[PDB]
């Protein structure tokens, strides 16, 4: 209907969109709207028209676009990125819960289906080279910069590659599925790096530090 492409990055629009012609993507600090062409699987996106709103509000504005956007329809799989906010709220009323567990979404990833194949297609794979990132803090949408380390180049067996996401959803690396790291290894690497720096900082103020070894 409307092409918001090339429009202001934060100005409000005069109208209220019909929300059932759009994908509604809810993040911690915004609602992101991307036009939805009709499709039985409901996973086709029209990025030419996009809006962003404060949560549970109907006052729409054009989001900041930090990368070139797809021009034709594309099929994408959606996954969210964030944390659990598990709290222990104060107990005011009788039988007030001992904890509250809520999910806080800071980023949403839209991963293109390879050649736009459907989920139920027997040849369905994801195209990790084309990923679009919605950020809640900046109310923006961008394309991820992906580093491919799999040998094969553009023409390769996409059934063998694994996407690794690190650094608050900012680093994207495609590796071979045989180079998969154990979850224990991932956790222990992070702990070793942090405790190694903290220990050296603690030991730095000892006056014989410069004539001592790590071991």
């Amino acid at each position: 209907f409307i092409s918001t492409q090339g429009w202001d990055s934060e100005m409000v629009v005069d109208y209220r969109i019909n929300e059932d012609e759009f994908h509604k993507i809810s993040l911690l600090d915004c609602d992101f709207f991307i036009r939805k062409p009709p499709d039985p699987d409901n996973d086709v996106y029209d990025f030419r028209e996009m809006y962003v709103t404060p949560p549970d509000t109907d006052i729409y504005s054009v989001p900041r676009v930090l990368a070139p956007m797809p021009q034709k329809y594309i099929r994408c799989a959606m996954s969210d990125y964030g944390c659990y906010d598990v709290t222990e709220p104060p107990i005011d009323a009788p039988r007030d819960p001992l904890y509250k567990s809520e999910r806080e979404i800071s980023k949403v990833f839209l991963t293109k289906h390879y050649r736009n194949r459907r989920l139920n297609d027997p040849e369905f794979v994801l195209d990790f080279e084309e990923i679009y990132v919605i950020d809640s803090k900046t109310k923006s949408i961008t394309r991820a910069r992906v580093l491919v380390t799999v040998p094969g180049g553009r023409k390769r067996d996409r059934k063998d590659d694994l996407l690794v996401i690190r650094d608050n959803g900012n680093s994207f690396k495609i590796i071979h599925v045989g180079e998969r790291d154990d979850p224990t290894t991932v956790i222990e690497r992070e702990e070793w790096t942090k405790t190694r720096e903290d220990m050296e900082k603690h030991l730095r103020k000892l006056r014989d530090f410069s004539v001592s070894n790590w071991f």
């Binding site: 991963t111 996407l163 690497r189 702990e191 790096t193 405790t195």
Partner: protein
């Protein structure tokens, strides 16, 4: 001992409850009158101690929150036995005094102090050290591995505890626990360290303390918590205490 109970020696209990022991002997016709009932108590006739246990049950005594009410039980020895979170002994005589002792002065309706509303019987000293050691988790980082790295999986918590009983794991050795409840693990509010995203649609989110397995094709959501049997033991003890009390009441 329970929080609401105390132990009294025979020599102290028989003096405190002598009037009731005399009545119990006369009521059950083990003694003809008051004079005879006194001699059996004097001569330590073994039927006296059976009666003393009967009349003591359900009869609270006052011990001098300096003064509280406990349900006395007969104990072996010569000393008064008190539970670790706590000499004059008073036996209420009238039913009005016995009602007040049981319903107002017992050690479980006075769990909060009147000054600010703080709990009174918080574990201390050796009890507190035991919980601290129990819930001090696994060693981490440079204290866990000599070198920079550039664990067992248990289906349920009972299998993990059973492996600990068979000395297959230590109290603070890390493990993964299959979690079949909601995500109720108190942890730092942090995004995943790493997301492993397979091209067929499944992705693994690795957090500092748990792993979540999700998919873009199915509605699956599998949770594995990285914990120790110490944390599992502490969670189970409180949960089984709550379930045990509910079943018994």
């Amino acid at each position: 001992l329970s929080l609401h109970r105390c132990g009294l020696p025979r020599e102290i209990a028989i003096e405190l409850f002598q009037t009731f022991v005399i009545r119990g002997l006369i009521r059950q016709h083990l003694a003809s009158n008051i004079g005879v009932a006194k001699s059996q108590i004097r001569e330590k006739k073994p039927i006296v101690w059976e009666i003393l246990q009967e009349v003591m049950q359900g009869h609270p005594v006052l011990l001098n929150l300096g003064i509280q009410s406990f349900q006395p039980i007969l104990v072996e020895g010569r000393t008064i036995c008190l539970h670790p979170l706590v000499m004059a002994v008073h036996v209420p005589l009238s039913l009005e005094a016995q009602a007040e002792a049981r319903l107002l002065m017992f050690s479980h309706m006075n769990l909060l102090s009147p000054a600010i509303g703080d709990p009174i019987s918080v574990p201390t000293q050796d009890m507190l050290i035991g919980l601290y050691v129990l819930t001090s988790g696994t060693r981490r980082g440079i204290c866990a591995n000599r070198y920079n790295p550039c664990e067992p999986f248990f289906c349920n918590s009972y299998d993990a505890i059973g492996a600990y009983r068979q000395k297959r794991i230590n109290l603070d050795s890390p493990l993964w626990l299959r979690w079949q409840l909601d995500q109720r693990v108190i942890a730092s509010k942090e995004v995943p360290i790493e997301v492993h995203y397979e091209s067929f649609g499944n992705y693994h989110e690795i957090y500092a303390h748990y792993l979540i397995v999700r998919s873009v094709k199915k509605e699956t959501l599998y949770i594995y918590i990285r914990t120790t049997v110490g944390h599992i033991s502490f969670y189970r003890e409180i949960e089984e205490a709550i379930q045990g009390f509910s079943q018994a009441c």
